Structures are given as structure tokens and as C-alpha cells.
Amino acid sequence: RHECMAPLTALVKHMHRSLRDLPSWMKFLHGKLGNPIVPLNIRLFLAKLVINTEEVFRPYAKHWLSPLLQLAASENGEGIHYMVVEIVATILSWTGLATPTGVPKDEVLANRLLNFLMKHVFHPKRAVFRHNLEIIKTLVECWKDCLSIPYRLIFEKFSGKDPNSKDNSVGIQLLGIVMANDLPPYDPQCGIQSSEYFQALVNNM
Amino acid sequence: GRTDLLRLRRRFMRDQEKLSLMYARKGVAEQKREKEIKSELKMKQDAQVVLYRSYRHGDLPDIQIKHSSLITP
DNA sequence: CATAATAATAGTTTTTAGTTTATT
DNA sequence: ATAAACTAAAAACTATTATTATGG
Numbered sequence: 001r002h003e004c005m006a007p008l009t010a011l012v013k014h015m016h017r018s019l020r021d022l023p024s025w026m027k028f029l030h031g032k033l034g035n036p037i038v039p040l041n042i043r044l045f046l047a048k049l050v051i052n053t054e055e056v057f058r059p060y061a062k063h064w065l066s067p068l069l070q071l072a073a074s075e076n077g078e079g080i081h082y083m084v085v086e087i088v089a090t091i092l093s094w095t096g097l098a099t100p101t102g103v104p105k106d107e108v109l110a111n112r113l114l115n116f117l118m119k120h121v122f123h124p125k126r127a128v129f130r131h132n133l134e135i136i137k138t139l140v141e142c143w144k145d146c147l148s149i150p151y152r153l154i155f156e157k158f159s160g161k162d163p164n165s166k167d168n169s170v171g172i173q174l175l176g177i178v179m180a181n182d183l184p185p186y187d188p189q190c191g192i193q194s195s196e197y198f199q200a201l202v203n204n205m
Numbered sequence: 206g207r208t209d210l211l212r213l214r215r216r217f218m219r220d221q222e223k224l225s226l227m228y229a230r231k232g233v234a235e236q237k238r239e240k241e242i243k244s245e246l247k248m249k250q251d252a253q254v255v256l257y258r259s260y261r262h263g264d265l266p267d268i269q270i271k272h273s274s275l276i277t278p
Numbered sequence: 279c280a281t282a283a284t285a286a287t288a289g290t291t292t293t294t295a296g297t298t299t300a301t302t
Numbered sequence: 303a304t305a306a307a308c309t310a311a312a313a314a315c316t317a318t319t320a321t322t323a324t325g326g
Contacts, residue, residue: 089213093206125219126325128217135213227279227326234280
């Protein structure tokens with residue numbers, strides 16, 4: 001938890017009482033965050049702030065689109081997953097205010113974050129794992145703009161160990177996440193073979 | 206996806222409160238027993254009667270009622 | 279201390295080691 | 303002195319049911 005942020009929160013409340021990129025120092029902080037060099041102390045300060053300040057800059061989040069994503073990408077405090085999930089929740093709390101389909105920078109940031117999360121998505125727990133799955137479903141069905149499916153990490157996730165004990169079902173539920181989308185069931189692009197890609201499916205079947 | 210952050214925080218269970226969750230379910234169940242008892246005892250009573258006419262207030266009876274208002278009762 | 283739960287237990291047929299009763 | 307049955311066959315194949323690892 002953050003505790004020195006409370007005066008920052010009071011600042012946010014006061015400015016929003018007083019309150020395009022009309023500067024109330026969010027140009028200064030805009031530069032202070034856009035650089036992927038900002039120290040993790042200051043980086044996390046700004047992160048928790050903008051989490052608490054998502055409301056003020058709604059018809060501004062598009063300019064904030066690139067920082068958060070590059071802030072989101074390769075996050076390295078209370079826990080990496082913590083801030084990752086919190087910030088992506090903030091990002092998707094708006095949908096039409098900004099979309100990561102403009103400059104290819106936000107597009108590749110979104111794809112890389114997708115790879116990060118699908119690498120990270122697992123719980124020994126029941127719902128919070130399924131909560132992450134629903135997070136993936138929500139993001140993919142709220143953007144559907146530049147989103148592309150790897151199928152490879154996915155394949156090894158669902159092809160699994162040929163499970164005599166259920167483990168690769170994580171990949172199966174990932175496939176279901178894809179299935180909820182009108183996205184292709186599996187792009188018959190190179191992949192690995194595009195034929196056995198379903199033989200592994202029927203094998204675990 | 207506006208409650209998505211609220212969905213996150215409501216699903217922030219990683220302080221390992223499984224026993225706490227089951228106990229909360231227990232307390233909810235007990236309150237459900239109480240409320241269900243109350244509801245059963247209430248509903249055995251005659252349900253609220255339904256009306257069939259609009260009504261207006263004045264110094265005189267308003268004859269302007271319609272045939273429907275007359276014959277539905 | 280509640281509930282789509284779930285699964286480790288059990289119970290049917292086989293075929294061994296107990297034994298009569300003459301057998302010499 | 304038991305050559306037939308002495309006496310009850312110790313045992314899995316192939317099928318089900320209450321457990322809870324958990325769901326909440």
C-alpha cells in the first residue's frame with residue numbers, strides 16, 4: 001500500500017475542484033512518465049496516482065494511452081501482478097475514450113502485454129484464475145482492433161504433457177477465451193503445422 | 206467494462222481468506238434463514254389487492270370515467 | 279459453519295484348505 | 303490309512319456408490 005500518496009490524492013481532489021492538454025502540470029508529469037527511464041520509486045508514485053486520477057483526464061487518456069502501455073509493458077512495491085492488473089483495469093475502465101489502435105506503438109505494446117499476461121495467467125486458486133481469464137476476455141472483446149493470436153505458446157499451453165493429470169486445461173480455457181471472440185479458431189498460417197494443431201486438441205480430448 | 210477495477214478488487218482474495226469466505230457464507234446463510242422465515246410468515250397473509258381504475262380528486266365525482274374503467278371491475 | 283461438487287470405498291465370482299468315509 | 307470328496311473355496315474382472323482434496 002501507498003501512504004505518502006495521500007497529499008498527492010488531496011492535490012488531485014483540489015485540482016479537479018479547479019478542473020486539449022490544459023496544463024496543471026500534467027505536461028510535466030506527462031513527460032515524467034512517458035520516459036521509460038523514470039525511477040521505480042517515482043514510476044510507482046506516478047502509477048498509483050494516475051490510477052487514482054483516471055477520472056480527471058478522460059478526454060485526455062489517448063495521450064496517456066502510450067505511457068500506461070509502456071508503463072504496463074515489462075513491469076519490473078507490493079507486486080508486479082498487482083499493479084499490472086490494477087492499471088489494465090484502469091485502462092479498460094474506458095473504451096471509447098482511447099484505443100490502442102492508432103500509432104503501431106500502442107498496438108505492439110498491447111500485443112506484448114497480451115503475451116506477458118498469457119504467460120503469467122494462472123492461479124492455484126479457482127476464481128481469481130478465472131478472474132484473470134475474464135480479464136483477458138474483456139480486453140480482447142473491448143479492443144478487437146489490432147489483436148492477433150500467437151497460437152504457439154497457446155499450443156504448448158493446451159497440448160501440455162499429454163495429461164494423465166489435468167494441467168493443460170489452462171490452454172483449453174484460453175482457447176475458449178478466443179472462442180468467445182469471432183476471431184479465427186486457429187489461423188492456418190504457419191503456426192507449427194496447422195493440422196496437428198487440432199490433433200493435440202483431440203488427443204487431450 | 207466499468208466495474209472491471211471493482212471486479213479486480215472484489216476478487217482480490219490473495220490474503221488467503223478461504224476460511225473467512227466460508228464463514229461469511231455461513232453468516233449469510235443464517236441471515237437467509239431468518240429472512241426466509243420472516244418472508245414465509247408474511248406471505249401466508251393475503252397478498253396486496255390489485256386495483257382496476259384510475260382515480261381523481263375534486264369537490265364532485267368526476268363522471269369522465271371510461272367504459273373500460275367501468276367494466277374491468 | 280452453506281453448497282452443481284467429488285471421489286475412495288465397498289460387493290459380486292471365481293479356485294485353495296481345510297475335512298468323511300470308506301479303503302486297503 | 304485313505305487317492306472318489308472329503309468342505310467350503312482368500313480372489314479379482316468388471317461394474318457400481320459415499321468422499322471431499324474442493325465449488326463458495
